[model samples]
Target: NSRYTHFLTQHYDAIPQGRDDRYCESIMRRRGLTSPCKDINTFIHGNKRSIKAICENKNGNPHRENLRISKSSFQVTTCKLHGGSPWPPCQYRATAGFRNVVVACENGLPVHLDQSIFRR
Candidate 1:
């Protein structure tokens, strides 16, 4: 799971503060994820324990559980949908939000972004 969890940290800056097609476009570019139908899904939430079972199994230490995540899913526009061109620009439709589980790892996942440098 560290592979997946580690991926989250890579896109921290690319994740935007609001609904914007630009956020999706920039992230896709930065990540080199050029597939037209694929989207870089993100969830913002907090993690507060180190569970030996989950985190340790993945060579990671977990934080306290419960309410450790939030969610929403947006559709990143495909090249064909954007008139058959995939370079420099991409579009994404906003999605509904909900409680979710998110993970942000930085030199080992930290608790409470307020006191940390990143978000999950």
Candidate 2:
């Protein structure tokens, strides 16, 4: 469904660059993504047939209505957003979460994304 494509684009830049904790926290705040440690999932791309392997392992069924890929892989993780009284005023912690995503491509770019796992 086209909805999957839209979701990926909406979150394309949700992940932060580098390891600066402030980047994710500040972004989450600006994006209004609540939760001190909101969970985020990454997107991955592989041969479309690999979608079967990913789905089987993640308790996912590709035909599910809740199903949701891409050319660029994402690094899923946790972020800590704090309301602190310290000089820094905020603290953010992150845990790495990796996902193997498979997508349908056209002209070297992603067109359809196949989600093999339930996303956060």
Candidate 3:
């Protein structure tokens, strides 16, 4: 039972249009949040403004996912496989990176942080 298919498969599978526009899926279903590419790909906000329109992606994002925030217990982000651990999960996305927010509980789990709330 291992076919292998997880999340984040956009920006190259050809499908970078705004998902839908039901007022941006009604502000993510009024905050309940649940828009995983909808059907082909369209979760803009960086500049595309608002969007929405999906049918199914099961946990969403087709696979290789992890741009989520909330929507009924659904969180599982993986490192780009160079350091899922053993140190090093923050150093600034080198190639095509521009979104990050990780703070493993408390321990050696990438948590020795210091910056006083990092000042937003």
Candidate 4:
């Protein structure tokens, strides 16, 4: 679906080279998602095809309802609102890690990222 396609383009980054505050700002701006601060968002970094394969239940990925969990971990950057108003000039703290991700899929394509699993 077009919505899933858009979601993929907006959220997945195959060539991520880590991220900082400026990187987060640019990404949010380019994606037109910089308004009222997003609160929290995680961007997956890896081969697009490999990431998409998760939707196909690859590696016998676990699923609950319509959401699927990646059997393997992925590199990701999570941006969290630090201290900012609801409007522009938002501030974010970018944290990077390798973690399993949960996603919602439709028609076998990932449409929404539910969350990233972090071990204690």
Which candidate number maximizes TM-score?
4
Q: Which is the winner by lDDT between candidate 2 and candidate 4?
A: 4
lDDT for residue 101 in candidate 2, whole number 0-100: 51
> How does candidate 4 fare on TM-score?
0.86
Against the hidden true structure, what lDDT does model 1 obtain? 0.36
TM-score for candidate 3, residues paired by index: 0.15
Residue-wise C-alpha lDDT for candidate 2, range 1-120, written one tens digit per residue:
554354344233443565356555565555445433334423222233443333353423334353323223455544544455322334556444556455443433344554335344
What value does the lDDT take at residue 10 in candidate 4?
Answer: 65
State the C-alpha lDDT per candidate: 0.36, 0.43, 0.22, 0.74
The predicted structure with the larger TM-score, 3 or 4, is 4
Q: What's the lDDT of the predicted structure labeled candidate 3?
A: 0.22
**Candidate with the greatest lDDT versus the true structure:** 4
List clashing residue pairs in candidate 2.
44-101, 45-101, 69-113
Between candidates 1 and 4, the one scoring higher on lDDT is 4
Worst 10 residues of 1 by lDDT: 72-81
Residues 20-86, model 4: lDDT tens digits: 8777776776666777777777788877776777787673275788778888888888777777486
What TM-score goes with each of the models? 0.36, 0.37, 0.15, 0.86
Candidate 2 vs. true structure, TM-score:
0.37
Model 2 C-alpha lDDT versus the unseen true structure:
0.43
How far residue 15's Cα lies from its native spot in candidate 1, in Å, is 6.6
Instruction: Write one digit per residue (lDDT tens) for candidate 1, span 1-120.
Output: 565444444323333445455555555556555554333344232222321112233433344552122232221221111434554455544332333233434334433222121122
Give the clashing residue pairs of candidate 1, or none.
Answer: 48-64, 49-62, 49-63, 49-64, 50-62, 69-100, 69-101, 70-100
Model 1 scores a TM of: 0.36
